[PDB]
């Protein structure tokens, strides 16, 4: 039986659009360039796969003849993206697929569905997270992951599961992001850790969270992470991603427990100022932060390109300090706090600083120090830059 079915334009176009993002560009095996359509029992299944990441979504469908077909993914995406808002009639006829919408008519050559690899079966679903919380946490941590495939061991997000607690981490050796959150476990309690490619996980957080809840699949019991695969399911969309076989550093030990100095200031203000003074820095060379008497003196630049400085009111408690940072790394941290005010926790100009959201307890603390580190769900440790 050849596939004959009618679908809604927006449904088919959205599904194809999403499944098409995971498609490989000019893959080794030609069939990998195709999208798989399988219609049955008043539904259509649209799938893509590249041996590293898989995307599968199911949409409503008026089935006239259940069947399966494989068509060029990018071409299907371009076509579906330009169809008029009318029903989409899909009908496989021999070696070609007939796609009809409005007065437009397309006839494409099918692909070798037999040569197409079987999709990976997702492990057992371990737990479920609110979609917005998951998206925020991942977005907050991923900024700290490495972005260089020549250093793959840095390009991951560590996912720790301990009962109802989940800890996400990421680093590139110069900055560390950690987010603690709670989820609803769907299996007996687990105590496992894996390393997921950050780009794929963030992609799933942005484009994969179609619903309000997000189920994650890593296994069950002792076989959590054994399959080397992570499943991510939502309302209709389910994807898979290969795990990274690399060790994540020990980060709990680098998180300071006390701070000699502390500086609270507004995120928007600080961000704008950093981006302004950084205009004269030598390609994100460094920004100099001079804290003293509740005033933050920002400066940067050389005498050959130019130098800039700007003063900002700041709630600074502790010993005066002069510490420098990479502008991009700094604004990356500030942009992940998602709070009105940021609180820095400095030690020495040559040791990490703790950017974290401001808490009510910080307005209170004021003295000579030392000050104890506050408990916070998200933390962004940033290594400073050596000054001349």
């Amino acid at each position: 039986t050849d596939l004959k079915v009618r679908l809604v334009r927006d449904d088919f176009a959205d599904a194809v659009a999403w499944v098409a993002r995971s498609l490989p560009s000019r893959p080794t095996v030609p069939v990998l360039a195709g999208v798989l359509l399988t219609g049955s029992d008043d539904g259509l299944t649209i799938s893509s796969f590249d041996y590293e990441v898989s995307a599968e979504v199911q949409i409503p469908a008026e089935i006239a003849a259940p069947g399966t077909v494989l068509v060029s993914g990018r071409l299907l995406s371009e076509i579906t993206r330009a169809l008029p808002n009318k029903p989409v009639d899909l009908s496989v006829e021999g070696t070609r697929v007939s796609l009809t919408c409005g007065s437009a008519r397309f006839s494409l050559p099918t692909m070798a569905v037999e040569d197409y690899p079987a999709l990976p079966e997702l492990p057992a679903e371990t737990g479920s997270v609110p979609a917005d919380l998951f998206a925020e946490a991942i977005g907050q941590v991923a900024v700290a992951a490495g972005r260089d495939d020549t250093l793959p061991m840095l390009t991951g997000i560590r996912v720790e599961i301990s009962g109802d607690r989940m800890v996400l981490a990421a680093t590139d050796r110069f900055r560390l992001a950690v987010r603690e959150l709670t989820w609803t476990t769907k299996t007996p309690d687990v105590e496992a850790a894996v390393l997921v490619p950050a780009k794929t996980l963030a992609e799933a957080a942005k484009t994969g969270l179609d619903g309000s809840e997000v189920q994650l699949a890593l296994g069950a019991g002792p076989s959590v992470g054994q399959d080397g695969l992570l499943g991510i399911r939502s309302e209709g969309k389910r994807s898979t991603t290969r795990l990274l076989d690399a060790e994540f550093p020990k980060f709990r030990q680098l998180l300071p427990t006390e701070h000699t100095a502390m500086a609270t200031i507004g995120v928007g203000e600080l961000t704008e100022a950093i981006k302004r003074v950084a205009l004269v820095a030598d390609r994100g060379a460094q920004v100099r932060m001079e804290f003293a008497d509740d005033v933050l003196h920002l400066s940067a630049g050389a005498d050959d390109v130019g130098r800039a400085e700007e003063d900002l009111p700041v709630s600074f408690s502790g010993e005066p300090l002069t510490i420098a940072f990479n502008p991009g790394y700094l604004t990356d941290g500030l942009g992940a706090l998602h709070s009105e005010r940021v609180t820095f926790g400095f030690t020495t100009p040559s040791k990490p600083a703790v950017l974290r959201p401001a808490t009510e307890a910080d307005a209170a603390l004021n003295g000579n120090g030392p000050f104890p580190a506050a408990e916070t769900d998200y933390v962004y440790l940033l290594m400073p830059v050596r000054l001349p």
């Binding site: 680093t171 050796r173 110069f174 550093p249 980060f251 990479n326 290594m383 830059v385 050596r386």
Partner: peptide
């Protein structure tokens, strides 16, 4: 630029 780990 210093590093957190190696």
């Amino acid at each position: 630029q210093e590093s957190l780990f190696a």
